Ligand binder design. Structure first.
Ligand SMILES: NNNc1ccc(NCCOC(=O)NCCN[C@H]2C[C@](O)(CO)[C@@H](O)[C@H](O)[C@H]2O)c([N+](=O)[O-])c1
Ligand SMILES: [Ca+2]
Ligand SMILES: [Ca+2]
Lengths: 151, 83, 597, 105
């Protein structure tokens, strides 16, 4: 193979930019005042502490013990792409409930358990549990990066 | 009377000749079916040269003999083309 | 304490991620299948053996290849036509000298009950005499540049444009192009191969399209790149369904793919090389695809580039005979390697591999029905079946087909044996060639010869086979079944069998199919319905039962609903503990039981 | 290279500028991950810390070589994690060029 024909990560400018963000304290935090529970999803605003860019987290518990996380800009200049035709259906949701709260945290229960989601406000973070067993964390190394659409 | 396997190995009842199950190691008990892996089917082919074909081509839907006699219960109707 | 961190970095779009919480890997399979769907049920012929190269030169060559298979007693379902069959790489055309009568060629193949696959790539030669190009240009269906002109790159026909397959109107145009009126020279036994659909652009960055080319809705090419090929695959598959009036199941092979591509046919691992390490890597590559829903996977048998030594070609046939998509293919400049061109000892080994594959078609077909209904992969890593055996978590020189067969193909020149890891506490495995039983867990040293394909059947399983190998699968699909019962240590076994007409959607639209459950316990083998909705008119019957790990009974008694009780004759080998029940003679559609007294 | 960008002789006018997105996931108890084809690489995915991330970008690689993370013809952005105790999957639904880093603790 002729490797010089194909970009390494360092030659891919967005990969170079992203990969230079190393594990540390995330600047994103969730604005629990904006939290809204809906028929299909929990939505809460996220903010970059330095740039003040506002994002929207759409968090969903799904039937068949799945979670969906979608993050988009709050007021984008132009719509961002959302992949069509791959999903065979709009995935059936399960109801989210606030089953715990403190100053820096909201605990959500998917339906009637056993799956729970802990949204940490500062720094922004998500933890997924079956009862008390931690299954997976999101943004635990603080590597979330969302380049907003500029002028 | 019983049937003796052509190689001489075994002997089987008369109703196990052409009963669509392979009972003979040389395939000689199934000259008219597709049941034996090493059997052969004889095509008389009157008006042309007689031919032997693999047992696996009896009623496989493909016309192997010009007289069409290898396809007698397959849904393929083979015309006679021996001329 | 141990932990793995995963980080995803994407150029554009939103963040959109699904977390599939298991807890078992089969739960994950079900979770992901509910999101992106399941493996399309292949028409039966497409699970047979495919003979391809770049290129068979003309109609006479194709018919000589077809006749070569029959003259050398080797089965084959499909012969493939690569890009040199068209008029100067104008797709949907035929070279007027070398393929002047495609309908007559297709009719001769149909008379042998074989199929043909023609390649159709998504790049369209910029040529005012080319009707496809003129239609797409006139209707504005091409990918564009920012200045609004149609994008033009370079591929096999030279300068070429690229239809915007993200546009639903373009996909509908493409689908309608496969009608028998539009694709002149095509017929119902002609199926399709989509290649170069990354899309490949010879003079583009990284050999693909510019990031700032513009698609339907104004989206940039950088936004959609990885589903471009999927849309090609989808539109072609829909074309093959539509041309038949919605009755025939499609077969489309695609090079590029994405999540969801399992819905549209098969994929293969591209341009590999005729070398032993490329033979080896076909297992982890197709296993990685199987884990993410693409069960209809394979690699070019023999390697695309370079000429394989005969021993390597034999081992590749044996490897490919036990992988889902089974195609021999080769580069333009390679020597001809149709399998009868080798010396007789290599021919016989290849013929045996082909026979094993064709005999296992009912098994393969049932695994693919289970994949289609449940989302379970056909070819599986050992850890999927043995999730608690940590010594299996990295194995990639072995794999399972369903839960019943464990395969360790020979993948080294001059090998004298292989080391087979047989997993499972209190599990037994049967060498399907010698019937020798082996207890798990162990690493077994198995001596091999050129003809060896190390395959083991798991205790507790029932594998259905067509023991009457014919020239193609169409010829076999009404033939009787032999059941191979591998007894567990508890004297039990179970398995399934799916049957239908082999090529239509009638199983779905009319529930015209059979799903049988075979189960053994105590000393009784029982066939019952695993889905009562399915009914099928079929002459398929049970001609034989082979039971491994069984003692000699005193008598064998068969009971079928609607018939008197009857006696079966049988043969027993005390050395191998193998019991063969002669000609049960019962329809596969009937409930029945055999009792060993 | 954040806006107008060049690689070899090819130019990306990149009219919308930098728009990349990224996010990390931690899998406690998992030492083995699998998936994200297509790569000519081992079934059990390797750590990327000392080298290149795994790349998902449908590309035509002439005479591709073995045991490396270069992107090949197909991209399925799905990663499976297996341990003695549980199985998990991550499905990153994004159609753009995507890089995947894998690290162990
Ligand atoms: N106008 N074009 N000019 C031009 C002329 C020659 C060359 N050099 C030879 C390319 O080298 C190769 O052979 N690549 C493997 C291609 N493999 C594809 C396609 C195919 O081979 C035929 O459909 C299938 O059989 C394979 O299965 C499928 O994967 C180039 N070039 O840019 O290299 C450009
Ligand atoms: Ca007989
Ligand atoms: Ca015939």
């Amino acid at each position: 193979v002729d490797r010089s024909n194909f970009k390494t990560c360092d030659e891919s400018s967005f990969c170079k930019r992203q990969r230079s963000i190393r594990p540390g304290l995330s600047p994103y935090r969730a604005l629990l005042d904006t939290l809204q529970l809906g028929p299909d999803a929990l939505t809460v605003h996220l903010i970059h502490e330095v740039t003040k860019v506002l994002l929207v987290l759409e968090l969903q518990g799904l039937q068949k013990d799945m979670t969906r996380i979608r993050i988009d800009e709050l007021e984008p200049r132009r719509p961002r792409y959302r992949v069509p035709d791959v999903l065979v259906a709009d995935p059936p949701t399960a109801r989210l409930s606030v089953s715990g709260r403190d100053d820096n945290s909201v605990e959500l229960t998917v339906a009637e358990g056993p799956y729970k989601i802990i949204l940490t406000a500062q720094p922004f973070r998500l933890d997924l549990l079956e009862d008390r067993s931690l299954l997976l964390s999101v943004n635990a190394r603080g590597l979330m990066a969302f380049e907003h659409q500029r002028a | 009377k019983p049937f003796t396997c052509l190689d001489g190995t075994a002997t089987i009842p008369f109703d196990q000749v052409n009963d669509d199950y392979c009972d003979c190691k040389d395939g000689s008990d199934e000259p008219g079916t597709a049941a034996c892996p090493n059997g052969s089917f004889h095509c008389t082919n009157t008006g042309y040269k007689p031919l032997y074909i693999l047992s696996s081509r009896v009623n496989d839907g493909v016309c192997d003999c010009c007289d069409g006699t290898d396809e007698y219960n397959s849904g393929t109707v083979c015309e006679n083309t021996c001329r | 304490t141990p932990q793995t961190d995963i980080r995803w970095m994407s150029e554009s779009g939103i963040i959109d991620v699904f977390l599939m919480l298991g807890p078992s890997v089969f739960d994950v399979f079900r979770q992901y299948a509910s999101l992106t769907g399941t493996q399309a049920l292949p028409p039966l012929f497409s699970l047979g053996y495919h003979q391809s190269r770049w290129n068979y030169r003309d109609e006479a060559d194709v018919l000589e290849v077809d006749q070569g298979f029959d003259d050398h007693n080797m089965p084959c379902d499909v012969i493939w036509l690569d890009i040199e069959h068209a008029d100067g790489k104008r797709y949907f055309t035929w070279d007027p000298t070398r393929f002047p009568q495609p309908l007559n060629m297709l009719e001769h193949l149909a008379s042998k009950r074989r199929k043909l696959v023609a390649i159709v790539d998504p790049h369209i030669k910029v040529d005012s005499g080319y009707r496809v190009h003129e239609e797409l240009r006139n209707h504005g269906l091409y990918v564009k540049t920012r200045d609004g002109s149609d994008y033009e790159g370079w591929c096999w026909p030279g300068s070429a444009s690229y239809p915007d397959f993200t546009n639903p109107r373009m996909r509908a145009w493409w689908s309608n192009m496969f009608s028998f009126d539009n694709y002149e020279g095509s017929a119902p036994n002609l199926y399709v191969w989509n290649d170069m659909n990354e899309p490949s652009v010879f003079n583009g960055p990284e050999v693909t399209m510019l990031k700032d080319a513009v698609h339907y809705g104004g989206w940039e090419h950088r936004d959609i790149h990885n589903i471009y090929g999927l849309y090609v695959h989808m539109a072609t598959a829909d074309g093959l369904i539509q041309r038949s009036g919605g009755i025939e199941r499609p077969f489309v092979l695609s090079r590029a793919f994405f999540s969801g591509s399992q819905r549209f046919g098969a994929v293969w691992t591209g341009d590999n090389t005729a070398e032993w390490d490329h033979l080896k890597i076909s297992i982890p590559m197709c296993l990685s695809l199987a884990l993410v829903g693409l069960s209809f996977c394979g690699a070019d048998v023999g390697g695309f580039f370079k000429n394989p030594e005969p021993e390597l070609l034999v081992r590749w046939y044996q490897m490919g005979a036990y992988q889902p998509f089974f195609r021999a293919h080769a580069h333009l400049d390679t020597g001809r390697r149709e399998p009868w061109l080798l010396a007789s000892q290599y021919q016989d080994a290849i013929r045996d591999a082909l026979f094993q594959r064709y005999s296992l078609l009912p098994f393969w077909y049932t695994l693919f029905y289970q994949a289609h209904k449940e989302g379970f992969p056909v070819m599986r890593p050992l850890w999927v079946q043995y999730p608690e055996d940590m010594s299996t978590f990295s194995i990639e020189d072995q794999f399972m087909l369903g839960d019943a067969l464990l395969i360790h193909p020979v993948s080294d020149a001059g090998a004298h044996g292989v080391q087979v890891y047989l997993p499972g506490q209190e599990e037994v495995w049967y060498d399907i060639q010698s019937y020798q039983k082996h207890h798990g867990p162990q690493t077994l040293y198995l001596p091999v010869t050129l003809s060896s394909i190390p395959v083991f059947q798991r205790g507790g399983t029932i594998v259905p086979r067509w023991m009457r190998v014919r020239r193609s699968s169409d010829c076999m699909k009404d033939d009787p079944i032999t059941l191979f019962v591998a007894l567990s240590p508890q004297g039990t076994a179970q398995g399934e069998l799916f049957l239908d007409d082999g090529h239509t959607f009638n199983y779905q639209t009319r529930h015209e199919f059979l799903l049988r459950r075979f189960s053994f316990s105590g000393s009784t083998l029982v066939s019952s319905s695993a889905d009562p909705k399915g009914h099928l008119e079929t002459p398929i019957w049970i001609e034989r039962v082979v039971i491994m790990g069984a003692g000699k009974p005193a008598a064998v008694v068969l009971q079928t609903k609607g018939s008197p009780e009857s006696r079966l004759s049988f043969q027993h080998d005390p050395e191998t503990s193998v019991l063969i029940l002669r000609k049960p003679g019962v329809s596969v559609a009937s409930d029945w039981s055999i009792h060993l007294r | 290279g954040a806006w107008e960008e060049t690689f070899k002789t090819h130019s990306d006018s990149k009219p919308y500028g930098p728009t990349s997105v990224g996010l990390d996931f931690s899998l406690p108890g998992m030492e083995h991950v699998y998936g994200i084809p297509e790569h000519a690489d081992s079934l059990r995915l390797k750590v990327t810390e000392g080298g290149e991330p795994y790349r998902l970008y449908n590309l035509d690689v002439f005479q591709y070589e073995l045991n490396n993370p270069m992107a090949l013809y197909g991209s399925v952005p799905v990663l499976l994690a297996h341990s003695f105790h549980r199985d998990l999957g991550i499905f990153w639904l994004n159609a753009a060029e995507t890089w995947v880093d894998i690290s162990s603790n």
